[model samples]
Target chain A: ALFTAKVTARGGRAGHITSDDGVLDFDIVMPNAAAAGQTGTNPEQLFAAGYAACFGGALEHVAKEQNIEIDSEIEGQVSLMKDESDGGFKIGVTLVVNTKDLDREKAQELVNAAHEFCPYSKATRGNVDVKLELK
Target chain B: ALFTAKVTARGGRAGHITSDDGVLDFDIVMPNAAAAGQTGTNPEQLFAAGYAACFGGALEHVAKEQNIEIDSEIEGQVSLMKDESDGGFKIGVTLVVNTKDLDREKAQELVNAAHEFCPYSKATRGNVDVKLELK
Candidate 1:
């Protein structure tokens, strides 16, 4: 809710930009080089973590409904790519689930079902490229 | 630590399996059909949302450091797939970011730096694939 307009002006030959909200003082100096050795979130990593957590939650619900006793622990990963033409990005994801009482087939069934219900999946379908793997 | 194994035996025409921890009871019936209209998480959607949030957070940090003022908002999406060889899954992801004051060059620099610093990127660097875009 605390969003307004951003103002940018020329700095020097090196090109410095500023973002001003007027009331609140927020400004940043542009870097001269490619950001290397930097740290932040990427498409793949977020996919892995979010999917793992959401799927885990969905699995819990399924267990309750099926009257099955089980606990789910998940480890997930995602791979990403960029589109040259449109400057678009993509991702690949995998989830390793540790559960008790569910076989691969049964687990797949539940996982697939949960996938349809996952708010994350519903929101992103057709908008981008994604893949899923369960183990 | 709570892992034992599963037991599968013949039950009429269909295979019935049970996950047994001895101390706990967790079992489910395998579905007979492809799960349709199911709801759950996919790698791509997770990636999109996560990446967007991470970028937003990184932008905020960079703004403070550079004295730039800007408000951030983001939207994201993902794509999914399955590998033919090992039955593995993959994902494609995309994120749309809205920021103020920072030009394309400056924003890219800050984002690149943040990517290096983000825990999410470090964890999935070589493990998963991803793509990024700016708007």
Candidate 2:
């Protein structure tokens, strides 16, 4: 293991979460049945935040490696849905990338390369439904 | 989608991250060459936190279905590793569960069931290396 992050949670959904480094301190909320109007953060939101940042970094790394100068932004959306087959909850992720200097073709290439290099993308590949859109 | 979360990031590793809902706002720092000792939170930490909470919720949900009583705590550790096959970065997760009221055998059963039900677990299945421990 090159690097590690440890987090502890108590009380399930409505609980507290803290990292060992003390950089992140927060509380989480379990949404109601409709999963709406929750005041606190949830796991899916955390996933979205992490993925957005990670993918943005990956994209920039690849762009620099290829000597492609561009300003990039990434938005990640995570949705909680029920699996039709098992009636179990699952998540779907969408990554939308905006590159100011790169054309669509070039941006797409960078996104593909970044996905290969990103730890989150590599970890969730094939197991999660991930949709990538370049703008 | 029963629930949705959107996160946007700019400039990648050494950038800013905020959720659309305004619940999470933070800056991220890029790791050094060794990928260690960064001042800010990284995606792996967020993943660990989210996964721990998500798994805890799943565990409690299954316990309710089986009428089992448990006081559970979850600690999740996510490690960045190099994929031996691809020479790229990947992540390995370890989930440690503490169940105060359940026997060891029953605790393990619940953990197994929770893994099946957890959206994070289900989403990352077969794609990431995950280890589960009961205490």
Candidate 3:
């Protein structure tokens, strides 16, 4: 726990794990909730899942910003690296953009712009190694 | 996949789903990979896991920057909301900072600064709703 406090339940897989002030939720696979030995959902899973949708949103934003009308799909890769020194893992990410009518370079530039604006990336700067690639 | 010809095998829970330039990874569970009802990993989990650890790294960066000595645990949460119109979702985030010797106000501000510098946040900004909290 970052700062320990009494944690209540929000009633879902995404229960309030830490205090209300943190940016994390524990989808803990309680033995009752899942098979034994399962602790909970990890970070990479969250990034992979979150970035995919967020990237789509980002693309939409770019579309809106540039006044380009095109149908598209965005996907991303989130990786977790085991920290040898602290017995923890580091989070790394890569993004893939697939869209029609938009060139790869412009799509990439858009994602990069989103990176600058995305609160998650902003908060984690100098922390996570998030990489992006557009197709 | 971004800039891709084809994605071969890395083979694990977090396999290489996209081509080489992106900041995202997908863990799309084949119907064979998991139970029939499951999809795959989500972005919020990745961000939470990544940001928590990455924030730790950033803390270490700050500690090194300020030459302060402290020991603490870091944690995070990621939330995803399903999009109504497009049958999709959006990623939102919040971070909790709990550390001794560090002032609450400063800690909160630090995360905000991290948001400005993080690559992932950079990629998804103006695209996702990410919030931060401190304890």
Candidate 4:
């Protein structure tokens, strides 16, 4: 294993969560729609934030491997959707990569390569619907 | 869609990331072995935190549906591993549920039901390796 992160959540949606390594600690607030005026964060938002950073890192790794220079910003949007097909819930991710150094074609190629290289992207492949956009 | 969250990341492993909703903001820090004395957070820890919370919420939801009361704390461990077969990376997750109100049989039932309901579990099904433990 390259890395292992341990996290514990107490009180479910109305509680607190933290990582054992002291990297992340926060109050668990249900989403705005789930509870109005909730004063904290939700799991979907955390997923979005983590996936964005991870994907960005993977992009950089691939760019470095290819000997390509990339000045880039990555944005990730994660959505919690009702799985009408299964009567439960599912997640979808949209990743937008804005690159200043790489051209359009090269940027798209790198983005695709990153998707292949990123652990989150690999874990969610064929399970989560991911849309990738380059700008 | 029940909820949507947007997150932005800059500078890959040596940068900053924040959720557009202002719920999460942190400096990017590589893991302990990735870099020594680094002071920041990484995506894998965030994912572990989020998954723990999400699974706990889902467990609560399922317990409620079954009219079962559960005093539970959930722990999630996420591992990033090198995929030797694919020459890339992969993720593995282990979820632990400790319940006070529910007995062994009932707790197991609820945990299984939660796996079917949780968005994170649904998203990684058939892709990531997930192990579940109850106490």
Q: lDDT per model, in order?
A: 0.43, 0.85, 0.48, 0.84
User: Candidate 2, residues B65-111: lDDT per residue as tens digits?
Assistant: 88875688889999988888886678999998989878889888889
Native contact fraction (fnat) of model 1: 0.06
Q: What is the C-alpha RMSD of each candidate to the true structure, in Å?
A: 15.5, 2.5, 12.1, 1.8
**Per-residue lDDT of A1-135 in model 2, one digit per residue for the tens?**
888889988767677788887777777864444266656778998999999988998898888899976577889999989888788888899999988856888889999999998888877878788999987
Candidate 3, superposed: residue stretches over 4 Å from native: A1-40, A84-87, B1-135
**Cα distance off (Å), candidate 1, residue B124:** 1.6
The candidate with the higher lDDT, 1 or 4, is: 4
- Per residue, candidate 3 scores C-alpha lDDT tens digits across B33-116 of 344554443334445564564455455555555665434355555564554544443445565566656777776666676565
Strongest candidate by DockQ: 4
Q: How does model 1 score on DockQ?
A: 0.06
Rank list by TM-score: 4, 2, 3, 1
Fraction of native A-B contacts kept, per candidate: 0.06, 0.88, 0.08, 0.88
Model 4 residue runs over 4 Å out of place are A33-36, B33-36
Docking class of 1: incorrect
- Per-residue lDDT for A22-97 in model 4, tens only? 6677888767444467667778888888889989999999999999767769888998888898788788889989
* TM values, all candidates: 0.41, 0.92, 0.42, 0.94
| DockQ in order | 0.06, 0.77, 0.08, 0.81
Top candidate, metric lDDT? 2
- lDDT per residue, candidate 1, B1-135, as tens digits? 011112211121111222121111112221222156332222233344445555565556666667876566544444444434334334444445555556988777766665654434443454334455565
CAPRI category for model 2: medium
Better of 2 and 3 by DockQ: 2
What would you estimate as the lDDT of candidate 1?
Answer: 0.43
